[PDB]
Amino acid sequence: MSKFTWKELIQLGSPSKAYESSLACIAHIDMNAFFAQVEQMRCGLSKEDPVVCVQWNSIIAVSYAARKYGISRMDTIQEALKKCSNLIPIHTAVFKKGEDFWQYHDGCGSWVQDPAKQISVEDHKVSLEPYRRESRKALKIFKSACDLVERASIDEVFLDLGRICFNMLMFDNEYELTGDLKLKDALSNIREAFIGGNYDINSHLPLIPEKIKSLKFEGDVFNPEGRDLITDWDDVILALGSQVCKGIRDSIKDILGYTTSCGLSSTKNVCKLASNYKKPDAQTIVKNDCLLDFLDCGKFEITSFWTLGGVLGKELIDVLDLPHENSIKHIRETWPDNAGQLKEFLDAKVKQSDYDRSTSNIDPLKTADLAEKLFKLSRGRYGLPLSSRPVVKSMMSNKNLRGKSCNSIVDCISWLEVFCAELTSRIQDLEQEYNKIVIPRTVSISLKTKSYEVYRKSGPVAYKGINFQSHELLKVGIKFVTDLDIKGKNKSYYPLTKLSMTITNFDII
Template sequence: MSVKQEFSPGACLATTAAYSTSQFTFKDLRDLNDPSLSYLSPLSVISLIDLNAFFAQVEQLRLGLPVETPVVCVQWSTLIAVSYAARKFGIGRLDTLQSAKQKCPNLVCAHAAVFKKGESHWAYTKGLPNQATHKVSLDPYRRESRKIVKIFQQHCDLVEKASVDESYLDLGRLVYKKLLSLFPLLAEGQDSDYMPSLPDTLPEELQFRGVVIKSTEEENLIQNNTIMSLSQQFPEGPPTIGDWDDVCMLIGSMIVLDIRKALYDEMGYTTSAGIASNKQVAKLAGGFKKPDNQCVIRNRSTYSFLNNFELNDVTSMGGKTGDFVLQKLRVPPDKGISYIRENFTLEAIEEEFNDDIPLAKKIYEIVRGNHRRELVNRMDVKSMMSRKNFLAKHPVETLSDADSWIKVFAGDLYNRMIELDEENLRLSMSQVSNKEKGVIKRPKTLSINLGTSSGIRRSKQAQLMQYSSLDRLWEHFEQIGYRILRDLLETITETAKLNGGRTLKELEAQSLDPRKIKVASISHLSLTISNFIKANDSSLIDSYTGNTETDKESAQAKLKQMFDEVNKSALEKQEKEPSPAPQPRIISSEDKSYIKKLFDDFQMSNHIEEASKSPKRSENKAQGSSMKTSSEKHDSKYIKKLFEDYQTQASLDLTLKSNSGIQHAKEENTKRKLDIFQSLQKRQKPQSKSTDDFLNTLLQTMYCPQCKEEIDNAVEHNDFHVAMEISNRINGH
């Protein structure tokens, strides 16, 4: 049913209940009210709402064009979306821009938004942009998708965003509430009791919305009816309503139409929808009656509906997986899902897939339309990548050009991080606990992959600091990206040859304009962030430094006050009673990670200070360098200041190791000035045989005898133990 169509209610629907009680229990009904159980209930109602030719609709609405105008969304010379008005001219996504214009001279070709080289924000251009100097951005479509999902969430408590233009909705709570308002008796009864039989007629307001797929029995009845003479025929009636599951689907169809209309009224988008008992069938139904319509699959009509599809049409059964299953079960080429259902029992499928019983069970459920999967209102992001393949005629050949694309990639990833934060911060209360609600995720790793026209491939990664502020994180992406890029280019011998035998470091030390620094011809370049983790206050740098100068000063004062209180309490306790023998302190993995980050940042700050003594470089070079921004420098200075505070305060902690009082602690303080950086440097020098032996053991065995586990990086693991010892000394252990 179209969102533009006014619904005309008919007569009250009659039911055809065959038994005095329902086949469903009150527990089946009440499970609808629990998001964690709703999808498993035989009364479940799941919907898939699909935006019709989404990218083309976005461009049509952006340009203020009527729906009758043929519109295509273009990426360079390729069509990525075709409006239904354009499809009437025979235009499809396989058409080129040129062939599409030949079929429809009045076709509106809207190119997707693009990033321009050297710019971190996307924009629309007049006419077709230059592919050599631009990169396509999908951010406008992601932005509209976020708005659409928010509207769905205003009406439904559990929404799963399946893709940029598709969302699943679990309608369980809405259906349950409507049932109890119309049939108050359903609030009574024990969980194990069967629900009562349906009334003879339903309330007048309960009417199916959309196309209701007929069951096999209904189709046979219609077929038999056509055989009869005209005098014997009876008119085709409304869909059969035999039990409460049919009523649930009916109510679900009404709710989905209301949601689709709300979206159309607010944003102007038309949609198609499928309503069924699980995600698998709802997905197939969502594309069955397009555009601007919805399809209802009652439980009784699932088999007849699935007869329209092949196994490869089902999500997760496409491609090689589906082909493997079809070959394993020896399904004839012209047979679909019904063939497997009619010829294979669960035992027979398990016999064929005896090495993968879960897959066998999944196939059995899929061909019967009963494969149930829970809806989740967020997706675990593992990585994000922004990349560009450069035209053979226009490769990247200077350091300035390469830096310009790193800036573009960082801006692209920044926009996608905004989307990720919004998704994580609007989690449904029904899906996560209060402890998890509002969590944000941050990447731990940034990597660059590049390839040259001569076939050379290089990649490298680096660890990222974690910031709650996305603006700060965006700057960090750029800085680390510039640094890794230079490291990679240094490994390509052609770079030095192109610059008279001089390395990039030598060229930059001479303050040479990056536009004049040649690099090996780059054919493709990408920036990737990965290893996302839940961020907390102890791991976020700006939780300590703040986002403004006032925040940082306040944070520093609070930290100093905290240290003062802790040490004062310790000294008072020492005066009253001798301190016990120190116990080994267990440091959490988060604390270990943060200690290492603080030390790495201190080292970086020293490097920056040394670099700052060199002659001032050109403005263009400063933009492309890996030097920190003023905010980053402030962080480094502040962290260094924290360590200096530690040095001062840690001397007081030494009193905990002494039983001779405060005076003895002062004497010890004079003898032992705690300088953690000098201590670390000494431990890293080959002066300590035990330290050398430990590192050598790690290098030779890749096994840590202290942690009793295998390791990936011996030097890094050795640094970890040094940092842990620093922490012990700071805390007086």
């Protein structure tokens, strides 16, 4: 009999619990060099053109076509032009001082000789709205194919393929394994057992039928040890999941023209790593039996994992005295039998005299959770739910001013119009992306004078109706900017060096 039970398989049908199943099928999809792709498609260019998304003299996104010339975000536009003769830099859309809308200025930029075709940093501000808009289009497509999608970022998402995979496995009557073999015939035994209902949930699943081995994996199956492809039900779910992923990625490509790289495995952490394994346009599959081979391939360390890439991770390296190479395997073999072993080790470490609870990132009252977390991560079996990111706590729009771009109250207001438009688009994005009305109640305006003095004024903002944020924000901002203008009537004030509008106290309805 299979090593998995009916409960584990059935659990895939649960949106809230599927991620806990050892048969889970999670995917991570990335739209790489996204900003460059957006500009590429906007101007009708191909993925073969060396496009680079630009900002003033910096590069903020490098197409993979341009990376082939050794160009990166560390290069200035001029340096990149030297590395690539047929380079196509495209400046980001920008707001102009005093206007409440962004605009593209193709054919303009620091690299163009013509003095009449420049995009001055003094009276302009980059807008990333075009990218947020394109991202929302992709999200809609992802959400249309999968009932549980996590927007990890503007160019990355997680998908829980549980329901789709479970239903394909049990009810898909069209899918074809071969020209003479249908998925339904290959799996008649388990499908009949499922509808049969004569099983205990803790009973093991029957062995996979030899015919399901004809099922193909779509993408690259990370398998340096040459293990068999389909050996148990977890491989079957995963293979079905790869077919589904490809279809979803094909939809993003055909509708929007955006390429993606994808990672598929049984947990969020592993599929995210797999996603960045072959960064161009690819799909990497990590079978459960290949989890250790993958984690020990040489590219990863304990600090490669989600929450361990910062101060906590650095502390664990010291606390657990881990090597700088193969820390993952080290953790596995140093506490091989159970998490409790690691817990005991941690409990001894926390009681050590040199331990400083005051500045430690480790919680001495929850060593059980940490131990289990590390025990599992090191084996590629730590499942986390696809959660919908925390409510925006604060949004800021600011501008480090050069020269006299803000030489008076009229200038301050002109900049606030830009800031308000920015924050407004960003609020509407959070509203759509998560279908929720976001109303800010507190507004804070800060600024730095010519003499580097800092003035700040916070205060409540009204809501004379639905999405009115724009007009309302501006009005309160203009009042504060005027109030501070007067507070600095007798002082070297106006050639301002900085100005910012910050909104907080969010009321999500």
